[PDB]
Amino acid sequence: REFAKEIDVSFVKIEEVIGAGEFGEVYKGRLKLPGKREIYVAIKTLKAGYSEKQRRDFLSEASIMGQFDHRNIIRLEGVVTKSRPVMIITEFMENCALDSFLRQNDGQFTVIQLVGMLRGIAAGMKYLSEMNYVHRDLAARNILVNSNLVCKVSDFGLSRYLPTYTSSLGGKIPVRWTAPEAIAYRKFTSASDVWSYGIVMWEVMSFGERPYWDMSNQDVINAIEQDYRLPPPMDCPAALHQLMLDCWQKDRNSRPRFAEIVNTLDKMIRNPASLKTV
């Protein structure tokens, strides 16, 4: 496999560790392409002593990422595959993961600022689903935030090209974000991603509270089966909670598509009366 965004190792300058990934750390760095202004980047690495299987799974994320060019999808700046160490280089995201950003900034943002963050996420998901992909890991922890509150879908490891994806495993899926049919049958569609989006909406409107709080994974599966749904967060507009309930419809076919979600949010942003009743 050849990567269009392959970069020479000399173009990257690795700085401090900013996180931990499945295969190795994520660093802050600087990318200097010839004749272009230097930029800040984030660098995903693969720990030394990796197996060939680990290298393949690591680079399969870069192959998926390299197919996307959207404002609300983490941008691939470069890939290092022909030199050592192997790296995935993306645009730097100052405010890190969405869930931890919101918890560290509880009550700092207005309803309209939060709706703007949600609109960006739904826009990135509309793009991904229309490219015929299922994410399967949509959670606030897998959304990155920049300095101007622009939210971007990241973490494409579980992503699959579709329309249903039927998985071979069950111990990899994050239960409290996963649609009941995807838990029961390992059947992932864009509609199961819509379910996850509804959970992300709840995470955002509650300033990063854990979905279903302390309830075990088993308790969550059981509650969803008995038609329980998460209550509206503190001071949440009724129209936004209604949209969450629409994303959580038992029948996947009754759920809105990402194109309808974007449209609903665009109308709310333009109609202040819609975000007024709680």
PDB file of C-alpha atoms in Angstrom:
ATOM      1  CA  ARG A   1       0.000   0.000   0.000  1.00  0.00           C
ATOM      2  CA  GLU A   2       1.178   3.516  -1.050  1.00  0.00           C
ATOM      3  CA  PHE A   3       0.143   6.640   0.922  1.00  0.00           C
ATOM      4  CA  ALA A   4      -0.481   9.939  -0.954  1.00  0.00           C
ATOM      5  CA  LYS A   5       0.346  11.798   2.310  1.00  0.00           C
ATOM      6  CA  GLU A   6       3.671   9.951   2.901  1.00  0.00           C
ATOM      7  CA  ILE A   7       6.224  12.428   4.394  1.00  0.00           C
ATOM      8  CA  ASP A   8       9.998  12.216   4.877  1.00  0.00           C
ATOM      9  CA  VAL A   9      10.961  11.726   8.615  1.00  0.00           C
ATOM     10  CA  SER A  10      13.128  14.927   8.483  1.00  0.00           C
ATOM     11  CA  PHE A  11       9.935  17.058   8.104  1.00  0.00           C
ATOM     12  CA  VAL A  12       8.708  16.110  11.615  1.00  0.00           C
ATOM     13  CA  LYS A  13      10.037  17.283  14.959  1.00  0.00           C
ATOM     14  CA  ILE A  14       8.648  15.293  17.917  1.00  0.00           C
ATOM     15  CA  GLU A  15       8.113  17.229  21.168  1.00  0.00           C
ATOM     16  CA  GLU A  16       6.221  16.316  24.426  1.00  0.00           C
ATOM     17  CA  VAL A  17       3.871  13.312  24.991  1.00  0.00           C
ATOM     18  CA  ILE A  18       0.210  14.560  24.906  1.00  0.00           C
ATOM     19  CA  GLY A  19      -1.531  11.166  25.249  1.00  0.00           C
ATOM     20  CA  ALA A  20      -1.561   7.379  25.036  1.00  0.00           C
ATOM     21  CA  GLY A  21      -2.928   5.335  22.109  1.00  0.00           C
ATOM     22  CA  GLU A  22      -3.612   1.575  21.675  1.00  0.00           C
ATOM     23  CA  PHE A  23      -0.239   1.009  19.889  1.00  0.00           C
ATOM     24  CA  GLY A  24       1.896   3.779  21.470  1.00  0.00           C
ATOM     25  CA  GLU A  25       1.964   7.385  22.596  1.00  0.00           C
ATOM     26  CA  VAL A  26       0.582  10.520  20.921  1.00  0.00           C
ATOM     27  CA  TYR A  27       3.046  13.408  20.894  1.00  0.00           C
ATOM     28  CA  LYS A  28       2.852  17.095  20.126  1.00  0.00           C
ATOM     29  CA  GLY A  29       5.160  18.026  17.291  1.00  0.00           C
ATOM     30  CA  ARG A  30       6.028  20.391  14.481  1.00  0.00           C
ATOM     31  CA  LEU A  31       5.632  19.650  10.764  1.00  0.00           C
ATOM     32  CA  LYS A  32       7.746  21.549   8.241  1.00  0.00           C
ATOM     33  CA  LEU A  33       6.900  20.831   4.590  1.00  0.00           C
ATOM     34  CA  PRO A  34       9.308  22.386   2.029  1.00  0.00           C
ATOM     35  CA  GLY A  35       8.292  25.965   1.156  1.00  0.00           C
ATOM     36  CA  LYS A  36       5.372  25.999   3.662  1.00  0.00           C
ATOM     37  CA  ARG A  37       5.042  27.629   7.118  1.00  0.00           C
ATOM     38  CA  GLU A  38       5.765  25.188  10.009  1.00  0.00           C
ATOM     39  CA  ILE A  39       2.630  23.909  11.817  1.00  0.00           C
ATOM     40  CA  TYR A  40       1.860  22.249  15.154  1.00  0.00           C
ATOM     41  CA  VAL A  41       0.808  18.596  14.729  1.00  0.00           C
ATOM     42  CA  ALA A  42      -0.168  15.573  16.833  1.00  0.00           C
ATOM     43  CA  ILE A  43       1.815  12.364  16.125  1.00  0.00           C
ATOM     44  CA  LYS A  44       0.513   8.811  16.766  1.00  0.00           C
ATOM     45  CA  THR A  45       3.396   6.318  17.097  1.00  0.00           C
ATOM     46  CA  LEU A  46       3.661   2.539  17.277  1.00  0.00           C
ATOM     47  CA  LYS A  47       5.864   1.243  20.196  1.00  0.00           C
ATOM     48  CA  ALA A  48       9.188  -0.409  19.205  1.00  0.00           C
ATOM     49  CA  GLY A  49       8.970  -4.232  19.130  1.00  0.00           C
ATOM     50  CA  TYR A  50       5.549  -4.210  17.446  1.00  0.00           C
ATOM     51  CA  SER A  51       4.330  -7.339  15.577  1.00  0.00           C
ATOM     52  CA  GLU A  52       3.509  -7.208  11.821  1.00  0.00           C
ATOM     53  CA  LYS A  53      -0.209  -7.575  12.752  1.00  0.00           C
ATOM     54  CA  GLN A  54       0.064  -4.511  15.036  1.00  0.00           C
ATOM     55  CA  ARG A  55       1.762  -2.514  12.241  1.00  0.00           C
ATOM     56  CA  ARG A  56      -1.002  -3.493   9.741  1.00  0.00           C
ATOM     57  CA  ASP A  57      -3.825  -2.514  12.196  1.00  0.00           C
ATOM     58  CA  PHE A  58      -1.981   0.741  13.044  1.00  0.00           C
ATOM     59  CA  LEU A  59      -1.612   1.746   9.332  1.00  0.00           C
ATOM     60  CA  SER A  60      -5.153   0.611   8.407  1.00  0.00           C
ATOM     61  CA  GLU A  61      -6.341   3.713  10.452  1.00  0.00           C
ATOM     62  CA  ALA A  62      -4.114   5.978   8.230  1.00  0.00           C
ATOM     63  CA  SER A  63      -5.619   4.327   5.057  1.00  0.00           C
ATOM     64  CA  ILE A  64      -9.190   5.020   6.295  1.00  0.00           C
ATOM     65  CA  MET A  65      -8.229   8.603   7.395  1.00  0.00           C
ATOM     66  CA  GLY A  66      -6.512   9.387   4.107  1.00  0.00           C
ATOM     67  CA  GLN A  67      -9.878   8.921   2.286  1.00  0.00           C
ATOM     68  CA  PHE A  68     -11.492  11.864   4.237  1.00  0.00           C
ATOM     69  CA  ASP A  69     -11.370  15.633   3.671  1.00  0.00           C
ATOM     70  CA  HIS A  70     -13.926  17.318   5.971  1.00  0.00           C
ATOM     71  CA  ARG A  71     -13.715  20.146   8.583  1.00  0.00           C
ATOM     72  CA  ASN A  72     -15.277  17.884  11.266  1.00  0.00           C
ATOM     73  CA  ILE A  73     -13.036  14.830  10.540  1.00  0.00           C
ATOM     74  CA  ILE A  74      -9.490  14.922  12.006  1.00  0.00           C
ATOM     75  CA  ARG A  75      -7.167  15.912   9.121  1.00  0.00           C
ATOM     76  CA  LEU A  76      -4.310  13.615   8.093  1.00  0.00           C
ATOM     77  CA  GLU A  77      -1.252  15.843   7.547  1.00  0.00           C
ATOM     78  CA  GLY A  78       1.225  13.040   6.931  1.00  0.00           C
ATOM     79  CA  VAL A  79       2.098   9.339   7.326  1.00  0.00           C
ATOM     80  CA  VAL A  80       5.563   7.733   7.920  1.00  0.00           C
ATOM     81  CA  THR A  81       5.617   4.140   6.562  1.00  0.00           C
ATOM     82  CA  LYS A  82       8.861   3.983   4.475  1.00  0.00           C
ATOM     83  CA  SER A  83      11.168   5.049   7.323  1.00  0.00           C
ATOM     84  CA  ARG A  84      11.374   4.310  11.065  1.00  0.00           C
ATOM     85  CA  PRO A  85       9.473   4.984  13.315  1.00  0.00           C
ATOM     86  CA  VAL A  86       6.031   4.578  11.707  1.00  0.00           C
ATOM     87  CA  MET A  87       3.836   7.666  12.472  1.00  0.00           C
ATOM     88  CA  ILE A  88       0.294   9.009  11.765  1.00  0.00           C
ATOM     89  CA  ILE A  89       0.451  12.862  11.718  1.00  0.00           C
ATOM     90  CA  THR A  90      -2.707  14.970  12.194  1.00  0.00           C
ATOM     91  CA  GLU A  91      -3.696  18.606  12.769  1.00  0.00           C
ATOM     92  CA  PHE A  92      -2.975  19.591  16.403  1.00  0.00           C
ATOM     93  CA  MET A  93      -6.131  19.869  18.639  1.00  0.00           C
ATOM     94  CA  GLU A  94      -5.447  22.275  21.519  1.00  0.00           C
ATOM     95  CA  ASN A  95      -8.427  21.332  23.678  1.00  0.00           C
ATOM     96  CA  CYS A  96      -7.964  17.507  23.456  1.00  0.00           C
ATOM     97  CA  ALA A  97     -10.882  15.016  23.943  1.00  0.00           C
ATOM     98  CA  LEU A  98     -14.403  16.464  24.111  1.00  0.00           C
ATOM     99  CA  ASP A  99     -15.541  14.617  27.304  1.00  0.00           C
ATOM    100  CA  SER A 100     -12.507  15.732  29.411  1.00  0.00           C
ATOM    101  CA  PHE A 101     -12.587  19.257  27.873  1.00  0.00           C
ATOM    102  CA  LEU A 102     -16.256  19.728  28.981  1.00  0.00           C
ATOM    103  CA  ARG A 103     -15.621  18.329  32.527  1.00  0.00           C
ATOM    104  CA  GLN A 104     -12.651  20.727  32.944  1.00  0.00           C
ATOM    105  CA  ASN A 105     -14.918  23.582  31.718  1.00  0.00           C
ATOM    106  CA  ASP A 106     -18.246  22.829  33.465  1.00  0.00           C
ATOM    107  CA  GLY A 107     -20.798  25.627  32.808  1.00  0.00           C
ATOM    108  CA  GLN A 108     -18.254  27.713  30.769  1.00  0.00           C
ATOM    109  CA  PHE A 109     -20.359  27.502  27.521  1.00  0.00           C
ATOM    110  CA  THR A 110     -23.849  28.659  26.465  1.00  0.00           C
ATOM    111  CA  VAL A 111     -26.542  26.283  25.012  1.00  0.00           C
ATOM    112  CA  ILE A 112     -25.882  27.736  21.502  1.00  0.00           C
ATOM    113  CA  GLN A 113     -22.069  27.104  21.853  1.00  0.00           C
ATOM    114  CA  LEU A 114     -22.830  23.452  22.823  1.00  0.00           C
ATOM    115  CA  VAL A 115     -25.355  23.110  19.907  1.00  0.00           C
ATOM    116  CA  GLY A 116     -22.600  24.430  17.547  1.00  0.00           C
ATOM    117  CA  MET A 117     -20.223  21.668  18.807  1.00  0.00           C
ATOM    118  CA  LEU A 118     -23.018  19.070  18.204  1.00  0.00           C
ATOM    119  CA  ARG A 119     -23.735  20.427  14.698  1.00  0.00           C
ATOM    120  CA  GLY A 120     -20.040  20.017  13.765  1.00  0.00           C
ATOM    121  CA  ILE A 121     -20.039  16.380  15.055  1.00  0.00           C
ATOM    122  CA  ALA A 122     -23.251  15.553  13.094  1.00  0.00           C
ATOM    123  CA  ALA A 123     -21.678  17.235   9.965  1.00  0.00           C
ATOM    124  CA  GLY A 124     -18.558  15.028  10.268  1.00  0.00           C
ATOM    125  CA  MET A 125     -20.793  11.946  10.746  1.00  0.00           C
ATOM    126  CA  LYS A 126     -23.002  12.834   7.721  1.00  0.00           C
ATOM    127  CA  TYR A 127     -19.762  12.999   5.656  1.00  0.00           C
ATOM    128  CA  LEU A 128     -18.432   9.637   7.051  1.00  0.00           C
ATOM    129  CA  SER A 129     -21.778   7.781   6.577  1.00  0.00           C
ATOM    130  CA  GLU A 130     -22.223   9.138   3.021  1.00  0.00           C
ATOM    131  CA  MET A 131     -18.626   7.807   2.239  1.00  0.00           C
ATOM    132  CA  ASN A 132     -20.243   4.388   3.215  1.00  0.00           C
ATOM    133  CA  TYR A 133     -18.407   4.004   6.558  1.00  0.00           C
ATOM    134  CA  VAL A 134     -19.624   2.936   9.989  1.00  0.00           C
ATOM    135  CA  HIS A 135     -17.505   4.384  12.875  1.00  0.00           C
ATOM    136  CA  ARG A 136     -18.752   1.968  15.646  1.00  0.00           C
ATOM    137  CA  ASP A 137     -16.816   3.940  18.378  1.00  0.00           C
ATOM    138  CA  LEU A 138     -18.615   7.342  18.388  1.00  0.00           C
ATOM    139  CA  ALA A 139     -18.210   8.761  21.941  1.00  0.00           C
ATOM    140  CA  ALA A 140     -17.207  12.163  23.326  1.00  0.00           C
ATOM    141  CA  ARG A 141     -13.816  10.586  24.303  1.00  0.00           C
ATOM    142  CA  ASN A 142     -13.171  10.004  20.502  1.00  0.00           C
ATOM    143  CA  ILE A 143     -14.011  13.616  19.499  1.00  0.00           C
ATOM    144  CA  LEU A 144     -11.215  16.208  19.515  1.00  0.00           C
ATOM    145  CA  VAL A 145     -11.649  19.969  20.124  1.00  0.00           C
ATOM    146  CA  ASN A 146      -9.635  22.938  18.886  1.00  0.00           C
ATOM    147  CA  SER A 147      -9.289  26.468  20.399  1.00  0.00           C
ATOM    148  CA  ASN A 148     -12.409  27.802  18.588  1.00  0.00           C
ATOM    149  CA  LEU A 149     -14.594  24.907  19.858  1.00  0.00           C
ATOM    150  CA  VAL A 150     -14.497  23.080  16.456  1.00  0.00           C
ATOM    151  CA  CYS A 151     -15.225  19.360  17.131  1.00  0.00           C
ATOM    152  CA  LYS A 152     -13.709  16.625  14.982  1.00  0.00           C
ATOM    153  CA  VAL A 153     -14.399  12.917  14.754  1.00  0.00           C
ATOM    154  CA  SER A 154     -11.187  10.899  15.368  1.00  0.00           C
ATOM    155  CA  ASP A 155     -10.203   7.219  16.328  1.00  0.00           C
ATOM    156  CA  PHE A 156     -10.964   5.283  13.121  1.00  0.00           C
ATOM    157  CA  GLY A 157      -9.583   1.892  14.333  1.00  0.00           C
ATOM    158  CA  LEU A 158     -13.042   0.261  14.546  1.00  0.00           C
ATOM    159  CA  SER A 159     -14.333   1.948  11.329  1.00  0.00           C
ATOM    160  CA  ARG A 160     -15.573  -0.341   8.535  1.00  0.00           C
ATOM    161  CA  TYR A 161     -16.641   0.109   4.886  1.00  0.00           C
ATOM    162  CA  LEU A 162     -20.294  -0.998   4.339  1.00  0.00           C
ATOM    163  CA  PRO A 163     -25.627  -1.748   4.327  1.00  0.00           C
ATOM    164  CA  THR A 164     -24.452  -3.661   7.432  1.00  0.00           C
ATOM    165  CA  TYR A 165     -21.125  -4.582   9.033  1.00  0.00           C
ATOM    166  CA  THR A 166     -21.372  -7.862  11.045  1.00  0.00           C
ATOM    167  CA  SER A 167     -18.448  -8.167  13.592  1.00  0.00           C
ATOM    168  CA  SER A 168     -16.669 -11.366  14.803  1.00  0.00           C
ATOM    169  CA  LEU A 169     -16.007  -9.980  18.352  1.00  0.00           C
ATOM    170  CA  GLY A 170     -18.035  -8.559  21.283  1.00  0.00           C
ATOM    171  CA  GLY A 171     -15.331  -7.597  23.810  1.00  0.00           C
ATOM    172  CA  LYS A 172     -14.107  -4.522  21.811  1.00  0.00           C
ATOM    173  CA  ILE A 173     -17.391  -2.505  21.563  1.00  0.00           C
ATOM    174  CA  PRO A 174     -18.135   0.304  24.103  1.00  0.00           C
ATOM    175  CA  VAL A 175     -21.486  -0.935  25.440  1.00  0.00           C
ATOM    176  CA  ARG A 176     -23.116   2.288  26.783  1.00  0.00           C
ATOM    177  CA  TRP A 177     -22.615   4.078  23.369  1.00  0.00           C
ATOM    178  CA  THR A 178     -23.695   1.055  21.222  1.00  0.00           C
ATOM    179  CA  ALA A 179     -27.195   0.513  19.720  1.00  0.00           C
ATOM    180  CA  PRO A 180     -29.102  -2.501  21.152  1.00  0.00           C
ATOM    181  CA  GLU A 181     -29.223  -4.350  17.789  1.00  0.00           C
ATOM    182  CA  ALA A 182     -25.436  -3.906  17.378  1.00  0.00           C
ATOM    183  CA  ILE A 183     -24.946  -5.383  20.886  1.00  0.00           C
ATOM    184  CA  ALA A 184     -27.376  -8.305  20.308  1.00  0.00           C
ATOM    185  CA  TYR A 185     -26.399  -9.190  16.712  1.00  0.00           C
ATOM    186  CA  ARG A 186     -23.027  -7.484  16.037  1.00  0.00           C
ATOM    187  CA  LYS A 187     -24.933  -5.563  13.263  1.00  0.00           C
ATOM    188  CA  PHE A 188     -23.475  -2.090  12.672  1.00  0.00           C
ATOM    189  CA  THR A 189     -25.100   0.404  10.320  1.00  0.00           C
ATOM    190  CA  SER A 190     -25.208   4.210  10.018  1.00  0.00           C
ATOM    191  CA  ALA A 191     -28.375   3.938  12.191  1.00  0.00           C
ATOM    192  CA  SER A 192     -26.312   2.340  15.035  1.00  0.00           C
ATOM    193  CA  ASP A 193     -23.860   5.297  14.711  1.00  0.00           C
ATOM    194  CA  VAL A 194     -26.951   7.625  15.020  1.00  0.00           C
ATOM    195  CA  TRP A 195     -27.720   5.866  18.381  1.00  0.00           C
ATOM    196  CA  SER A 196     -24.110   6.642  19.527  1.00  0.00           C
ATOM    197  CA  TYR A 197     -24.568  10.269  18.373  1.00  0.00           C
ATOM    198  CA  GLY A 198     -27.626  10.579  20.692  1.00  0.00           C
ATOM    199  CA  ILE A 199     -25.354   9.446  23.578  1.00  0.00           C
ATOM    200  CA  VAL A 200     -22.681  12.057  22.516  1.00  0.00           C
ATOM    201  CA  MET A 201     -25.510  14.717  22.569  1.00  0.00           C
ATOM    202  CA  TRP A 202     -26.279  13.656  26.189  1.00  0.00           C
ATOM    203  CA  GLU A 203     -22.523  13.766  27.087  1.00  0.00           C
ATOM    204  CA  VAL A 204     -22.237  17.317  25.640  1.00  0.00           C
ATOM    205  CA  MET A 205     -25.439  18.754  27.225  1.00  0.00           C
ATOM    206  CA  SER A 206     -24.344  17.335  30.642  1.00  0.00           C
ATOM    207  CA  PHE A 207     -20.754  18.795  30.390  1.00  0.00           C
ATOM    208  CA  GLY A 208     -19.106  15.349  30.097  1.00  0.00           C
ATOM    209  CA  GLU A 209     -21.109  13.242  32.566  1.00  0.00           C
ATOM    210  CA  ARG A 210     -20.652   9.448  32.126  1.00  0.00           C
ATOM    211  CA  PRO A 211     -23.631   7.945  30.225  1.00  0.00           C
ATOM    212  CA  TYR A 212     -25.761   5.840  32.705  1.00  0.00           C
ATOM    213  CA  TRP A 213     -23.361   6.996  35.512  1.00  0.00           C
ATOM    214  CA  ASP A 214     -22.220   4.029  37.711  1.00  0.00           C
ATOM    215  CA  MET A 215     -24.598   1.405  36.088  1.00  0.00           C
ATOM    216  CA  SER A 216     -22.662  -1.690  34.898  1.00  0.00           C
ATOM    217  CA  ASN A 217     -22.511  -2.651  31.173  1.00  0.00           C
ATOM    218  CA  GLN A 218     -24.947  -5.513  32.011  1.00  0.00           C
ATOM    219  CA  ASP A 219     -27.349  -3.073  33.784  1.00  0.00           C
ATOM    220  CA  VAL A 220     -27.239  -0.761  30.706  1.00  0.00           C
ATOM    221  CA  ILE A 221     -28.057  -3.653  28.250  1.00  0.00           C
ATOM    222  CA  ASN A 222     -30.894  -4.682  30.576  1.00  0.00           C
ATOM    223  CA  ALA A 223     -32.321  -1.109  31.034  1.00  0.00           C
ATOM    224  CA  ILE A 224     -32.340  -0.394  27.217  1.00  0.00           C
ATOM    225  CA  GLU A 225     -34.122  -3.789  26.695  1.00  0.00           C
ATOM    226  CA  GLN A 226     -36.777  -2.656  29.297  1.00  0.00           C
ATOM    227  CA  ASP A 227     -37.270   0.621  27.277  1.00  0.00           C
ATOM    228  CA  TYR A 228     -35.335   2.888  29.719  1.00  0.00           C
ATOM    229  CA  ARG A 229     -33.772   6.009  28.084  1.00  0.00           C
ATOM    230  CA  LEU A 230     -31.374   8.588  29.647  1.00  0.00           C
ATOM    231  CA  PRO A 231     -33.248  11.575  31.218  1.00  0.00           C
ATOM    232  CA  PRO A 232     -32.681  15.137  29.879  1.00  0.00           C
ATOM    233  CA  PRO A 233     -29.507  16.762  31.374  1.00  0.00           C
ATOM    234  CA  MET A 234     -29.781  19.814  33.722  1.00  0.00           C
ATOM    235  CA  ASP A 235     -31.549  22.782  31.911  1.00  0.00           C
ATOM    236  CA  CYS A 236     -31.574  20.896  28.540  1.00  0.00           C
ATOM    237  CA  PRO A 237     -34.023  22.347  25.900  1.00  0.00           C
ATOM    238  CA  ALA A 238     -36.931  19.929  25.297  1.00  0.00           C
ATOM    239  CA  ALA A 239     -36.307  19.949  21.488  1.00  0.00           C
ATOM    240  CA  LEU A 240     -32.707  18.799  22.039  1.00  0.00           C
ATOM    241  CA  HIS A 241     -33.845  15.983  24.411  1.00  0.00           C
ATOM    242  CA  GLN A 242     -36.517  15.023  21.820  1.00  0.00           C
ATOM    243  CA  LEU A 243     -33.735  14.725  19.172  1.00  0.00           C
ATOM    244  CA  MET A 244     -31.779  12.452  21.631  1.00  0.00           C
ATOM    245  CA  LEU A 245     -34.957  10.294  22.015  1.00  0.00           C
ATOM    246  CA  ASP A 246     -35.290  10.146  18.184  1.00  0.00           C
ATOM    247  CA  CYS A 247     -31.663   8.824  17.957  1.00  0.00           C
ATOM    248  CA  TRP A 248     -32.566   6.188  20.592  1.00  0.00           C
ATOM    249  CA  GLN A 249     -35.615   4.677  18.816  1.00  0.00           C
ATOM    250  CA  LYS A 250     -35.696   0.839  19.321  1.00  0.00           C
ATOM    251  CA  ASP A 251     -36.448   0.376  15.573  1.00  0.00           C
ATOM    252  CA  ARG A 252     -33.253   1.554  13.776  1.00  0.00           C
ATOM    253  CA  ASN A 253     -35.355   2.508  10.688  1.00  0.00           C
ATOM    254  CA  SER A 254     -37.307   5.076  12.811  1.00  0.00           C
ATOM    255  CA  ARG A 255     -34.013   6.885  13.725  1.00  0.00           C
ATOM    256  CA  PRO A 256     -33.155  10.102  11.773  1.00  0.00           C
ATOM    257  CA  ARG A 257     -30.249   9.942   9.290  1.00  0.00           C
ATOM    258  CA  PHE A 258     -27.212  12.200   9.894  1.00  0.00           C
ATOM    259  CA  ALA A 259     -28.513  14.565   7.072  1.00  0.00           C
ATOM    260  CA  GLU A 260     -31.760  15.183   9.090  1.00  0.00           C
ATOM    261  CA  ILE A 261     -29.792  15.694  12.335  1.00  0.00           C
ATOM    262  CA  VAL A 262     -27.628  18.486  10.701  1.00  0.00           C
ATOM    263  CA  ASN A 263     -30.839  20.062   9.292  1.00  0.00           C
ATOM    264  CA  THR A 264     -32.572  20.016  12.725  1.00  0.00           C
ATOM    265  CA  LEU A 265     -29.549  21.630  14.428  1.00  0.00           C
ATOM    266  CA  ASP A 266     -29.236  24.303  11.665  1.00  0.00           C
ATOM    267  CA  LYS A 267     -32.950  25.206  12.253  1.00  0.00           C
ATOM    268  CA  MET A 268     -32.460  25.362  16.058  1.00  0.00           C
ATOM    269  CA  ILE A 269     -29.432  27.716  15.641  1.00  0.00           C
ATOM    270  CA  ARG A 270     -31.669  30.011  13.467  1.00  0.00           C
ATOM    271  CA  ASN A 271     -34.815  29.741  15.638  1.00  0.00           C
ATOM    272  CA  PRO A 272     -34.127  30.809  19.287  1.00  0.00           C
ATOM    273  CA  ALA A 273     -37.744  29.914  20.365  1.00  0.00           C
ATOM    274  CA  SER A 274     -37.032  26.196  19.649  1.00  0.00           C
ATOM    275  CA  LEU A 275     -34.220  26.101  22.355  1.00  0.00           C
ATOM    276  CA  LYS A 276     -36.462  27.986  24.919  1.00  0.00           C
ATOM    277  CA  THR A 277     -38.822  25.288  26.409  1.00  0.00           C
ATOM    278  CA  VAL A 278     -36.983  22.816  28.788  1.00  0.00           C
TER     279      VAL A 278
END
